[PDB]
């Protein structure tokens, strides 16, 4: 564990691949490998450089589209949503440091073991020192994900994420189905709708309808803070998804969310009771 560290408290896997591919130092190995094993809900954050950062002028990434694709079986590029359905990837870039961040959130449930890599090629970059023209190298990250233990106690209306959520139904032309779930403390829940549907309130779980306060548009932070959540607006498959879990929250909570279209509408209803226990 030289560049990739996994903190258990935050369940965060931070990998730094900058000085390892720096083209200013003589290097004995052209391919530097680092392996990481991840489980449900783990978060992988890789901090890589850009073309603007010095010594990484001709830097590039493989697959060139990180947010969408990965190197499946360390071989052929494949959309990450295909092998890890319900995952969430984000790309950040700090112009002050010329450094980007690839952030991967593993879904709360992984139905099948998955192995895939990500390459960071800096071989094309170079520097000139003394009578030498030093070059960069490439670094490969091999990520393995275990089986995900338990199906999320959430709702799925796309019908595609049946293995991920407890409730799944194939979308119908005209339907007003409403999914009700009872969740406890430190239990996962979520929803899955089609991307072109309207989310109500927008970016749900972060701003849920305050059913106690008569279905009020308010940030969930006001209702509670001992919660963890995530959400993707549209994946490669064209579906919006969100997840939530309460952590040492003593207050009983009831909130809701809605995906609506001109043809049908679907509603998620969740009841957080810390004393509630699954049958």
């Amino acid at each position, epitope marked *: 564990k030289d560049i990739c560290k996994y903190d258990v408290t935050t369940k965060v896997a931070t990998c730094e691949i900058i000085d390892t591919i720096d083209s200013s130092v003589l*290097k004995e190995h052209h391919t530097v490998h680092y392996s990481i094993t991840l489980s449900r809900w783990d978060k992988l954050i890789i901090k890589y450089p850009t073309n603007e950062k010095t010594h990484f002028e001709n830097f590039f990434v493989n697959p060139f589209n990180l947010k969408d694709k990965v190197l499946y079986n360390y071989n052929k590029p494949i959309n990450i949503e295909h092998i890890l359905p319900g995952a969430i990837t984000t790309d950040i870039y700090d112009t002050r440091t010329k450094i980007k961040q690839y952030i991967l959130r593993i879904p709360p449930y992984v139905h099948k073991d998955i192995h895939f890599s990500l390459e960071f090629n800096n*071989s094309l970059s170079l520097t000139k020192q003394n*009578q030498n023209i030093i070059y960069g190298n490439v670094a490969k990250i091999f990520i393995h994900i275990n089986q995900g233990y338990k199906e999320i106690h959430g709702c799925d209306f796309t019908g595609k994420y049946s293995h991920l959520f407890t409730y799944s139904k194939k979308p119908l032309p005209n339907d007003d189905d409403i999914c009700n779930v009872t969740i406890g403390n430190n239990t996962f829940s979520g929803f899955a709708c089609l991307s072109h549907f309207e989310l109500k309130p927008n970016n749900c779980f972060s701003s849920v309808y305050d059913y106690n306060e008569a279905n009020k548009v308010k940030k969930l932070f006001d209702l509670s803070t001992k919660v963890e959540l995530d959400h993707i607006k549209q994946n490669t498959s064209g579906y919006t998804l969100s997840y939530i879990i309460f952590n040492k929250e003593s207050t009983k909570l009831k909130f809701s969310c809605t995906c609506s279209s001109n043809y049908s509408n679907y509603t998620i209803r969740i009841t957080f009771d810390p004393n509630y226990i699954i049958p």
Partner: nanobody, 125 residues
Framework: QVQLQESGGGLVQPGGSLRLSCAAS????????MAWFRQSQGNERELVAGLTRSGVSAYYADSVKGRFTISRDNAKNTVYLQMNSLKPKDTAVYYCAAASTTYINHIYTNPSNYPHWGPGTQVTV
């Protein structure tokens, strides 16, 4: 340990192409860094193309940049220098130099830093 041999160079009309090949014997090319060197009549030896031991980091001098391309057939143990759009300045005795280093990502600039050299082949345009 490694002996170099150039081949495939002669007279061409301005605007043509050539493929200079350089074969090694004694040890595999992967264990050596490779470079092509220029030398016109009564002038010093300059570097045109270079190649680290990684085989993927190729350097091209600004003179031949955008027209020359280096390659390494490790099966045939040969380095190929493709030279397209040949211009009157390219007229020189092209040499093939190889050095031995335990680093895979660097290439030397001065011809003195290269212990092993090969008998150059003349390329006139």
């Amino acid at each position: 340990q490694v002996q170099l041999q150039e081949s495939g160079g002669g007279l061409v009309q301005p605007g043509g192409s050539l493929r200079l090949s350089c074969a090694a014997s004694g040890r595999t090319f992967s264990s050596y860094m490779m470079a092509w060197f220029r030398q016109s009549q009564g002038n010093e030896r300059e570097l045109v193309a270079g190649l680290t031991r990684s085989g993927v980091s190729a350097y091209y001098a600004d003179s031949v940049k955008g027209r020359f391309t280096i390659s390494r057939d490790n099966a045939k143990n040969t380095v190929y220098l493709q030279m397209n759009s040949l211009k009157p300045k390219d007229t020189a005795v092209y040499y093939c130099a190889a050095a031995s280093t335990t680093y895979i990502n660097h290439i030397y600039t001065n011809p003195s830093n290269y212990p092993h050299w090969g008998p150059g082949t003349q390329v006139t345009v």
